[PDB]
Design a protein around this ligand. Structure first.
Ligand SMILES: [Zn+2]
Length: 258
């Protein structure tokens, strides 16, 4: 009976195995655009993905994860609110059963159809496992998805999903360029928070882009064909794998833009 997104093991149950679920800097949160304060001190966000090297894509029973070779100084996030350099290790999505829900962060209570998370670790801590034990261990770039025009750069991801339908399936996924998943503008909101999946560690600087990307209905429909279950188990569609907004508590959301 491990954690998931169902009635008996979903977000409202997580605190039992992971007490930090009720902690002081949990994610995601609602972004109140009128309360977020422009911070002229923020530096421009630097996203350097030109040398990114993808390895594999995996269905882990909670989402699908595209993993990168992070053994060299390549796909790096820096600047913005960050001190130092963070290296890309993986990205994944959260999405809904319907276009009207799916995102984890919300904007003035608005839910997007999905949300992309590009996860980077602080190189000062040597590797991901050590980084997540530190308050400034991770930087996650969050990008909202809305349904409209197709995102051509997402299609390579969508076409491989048939091969990793069920929990535990993985496939080679080389030469995928995550630059194809970025919106035009890098305007962002930033706040200190957590992983949004167990173990929910409070180790993330969140950087959430204001501009969503558009994906087509057909593209998101293919996300919804994935399965939470493993091969040979009763089919339960992988949908609504999002944690809802958590209390902001003692935190300020800063905006990079006015
Ligand atoms: Zn995530």
């Amino acid at each position: 009976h491990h954690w998931g997104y169902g009635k008996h093991n979903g977000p409202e149950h997580w605190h039992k195995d992971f007490p930090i679920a009720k902690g002081e800097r949990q994610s995601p949160v609602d972004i109140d655009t009128h309360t977020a304060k422009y911070d002229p001190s923020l530096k421009p966000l630097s996203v350097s993905y030109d040398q990114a090297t993808s390895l594999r894509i995996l269905n882990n029973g909670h989402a699908f994860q595209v993993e990168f070779d992070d053994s060299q100084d390549k796909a790096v996030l820096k600047g913005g609110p960050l001190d130092g350099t963070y290296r890309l290790i993986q990205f994944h999505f959260h999405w809904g059963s319907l276009d009207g829900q799916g995102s984890e962060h919300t904007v003035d209570k608005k839910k997007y159809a999905a949300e992309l998370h590009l996860v980077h670790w602080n190189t000062k801590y040597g590797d991901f496992g050590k980084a997540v034990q530190q308050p400034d261990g991770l930087a996650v770039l969050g990008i909202f998805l809305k349904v409209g025009s197709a995102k051509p750069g997402l299609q390579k991801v969508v076409d491989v999903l048939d091969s990793i339908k069920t929990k535990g399936k993985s496939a080679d996924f080389t030469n995928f360029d995550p630059r194809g998943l970025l919106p035009e503008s890098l305007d962002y909101w930033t706040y200190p928070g957590s992983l949004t999946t167990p173990p929910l560690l409070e180790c993330v600087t969140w950087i959430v882009l204001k501009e969503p990307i558009s994906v087509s209905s057909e593209q998101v429909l293919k996300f919804r064909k994935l399965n939470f279950n493993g091969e040979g188990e009763p089919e339960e569609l992988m949908v609504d794998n999002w944690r809802p907004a958590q209390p902001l508590k003692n935190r300020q959301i800063k905006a990079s833009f006015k």
